[PDB]
Amino acid sequence: KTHVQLSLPVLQVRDVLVRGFGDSVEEVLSEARQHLKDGTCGLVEVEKGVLPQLEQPYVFIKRSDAAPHGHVMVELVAELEGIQYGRSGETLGVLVPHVGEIPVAYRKVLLRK
């Protein structure tokens, strides 16, 4: 399937134990996609002071369309030193590994895979 229905645990930035997916744009996009597939991916909502607490390169989910079965259609865009790899809509948040942090909410997305 070109799209997969996922429910992403929304984590508080200060709870996150593993603050990024790796060391290159290509690695973080790779790792993000693997964790999304394996159900080991969390979402941090971006506000003032969040991103400097996480590790670059960042992986964002961005709205790719204006929402089947409650699931917002999203795609992945990486960012490193202010350059983005991909072009998409509004940021829903930054992806991080999930290693058992308690979420505050779930974000239903339809991920272009």
Side-chain angles (χ1 to χ4, degrees), residues 1-112:
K1 279 181 192 315
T2 69
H3 284 80
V4 56
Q5 279 181 355
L6 300 172
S7 287
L8 298 184
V10 174
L11 308 180
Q12 305 194 304
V13 66
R14 287 181 189 281
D15 287 338
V16 171
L17 296 179
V18 186
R19 283 171 183 277
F21 281 115
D23 297 329
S24 74
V25 159
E26 293 160 82
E27 188 179 16
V28 299
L29 283 170
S30 185
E31 284 291 330
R33 286 189 171 98
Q34 192 67 61
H35 281 82
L36 286 160
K37 177 234 166 109
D38 298 340
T40 57
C41 193
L43 180 63
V44 182
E45 292 188 321
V46 176
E47 288 176 353
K48 289 303 194 294
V50 165
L51 285 180
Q53 293 188 72
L54 297 174
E55 293 174 336
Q56 296 192 50
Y58 311 128
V59 177
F60 299 107
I61 50 159
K62 281 178 166 304
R63 191 197 211 87
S64 69
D65 188 12
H69 315 270
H71 293 250
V72 170
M73 297 195 42
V74 301
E75 57 200 338
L76 302 192
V77 173
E79 180 185 307
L80 178 59
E81 292 153 358
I83 303 166
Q84 293 199 337
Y85 300 81
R87 168 175 213 270
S88 187
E90 193 197 348
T91 293
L92 275 76
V94 49
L95 299 182
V96 293
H98 188 214
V99 298
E101 300 92 336
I102 306 305
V104 295
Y106 288 92
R107 197 71 208 251
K108 293 185 293 174
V109 307
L110 198 45
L111 167 70
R112 192 174 298 168

